[PDB]
């Protein structure tokens, strides 16, 4: 099956993707800190795992959640909602493209 990337449900995604979407001026492609906060405020959660979710979320701890970003996050809260534990680290199922490796050093000589 095609859009079989990514282990959170597509019609899932797409709901969460559209909000994101329609919170975005169609422009920013990804929310800020408080701004991704304030919509997790109002899962009305507490912040020990609302920081926690952050905390596992924010794959390289900028302060930044895009769309895949917020689908992770949100999808979490979802799982907290469910009243199912969540895990202490991150599964590379609900990890998106391209962030699953970051290294922006290379330096190696030895020849």
Known sequence: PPVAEWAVPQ??????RQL???????MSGHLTG???????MQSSL???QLASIWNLSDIDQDGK????EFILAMHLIDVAM???????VLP???????FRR??????????
């Open 11 to 16: 019609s899932s995604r797409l709901k969460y």
């Open 20 to 26: 994101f979407n329609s919170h975005d001026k169609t």
């Open 34 to 40: 408080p701004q991704a906060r304030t919509i997790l």
């Open 46 to 48: 507490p912040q020990a």
């Open 65 to 68: 959640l895009t769309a895949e």
């Open 82 to 88: 469910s009243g199912q534990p969540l895990p202490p």
């Open 92 to 98: 590379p199922e609900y990890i998106p493209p391209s």
């Open 102 to 111: 970051v290294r922006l050093e290379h330096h190696h000589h030895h020849h």
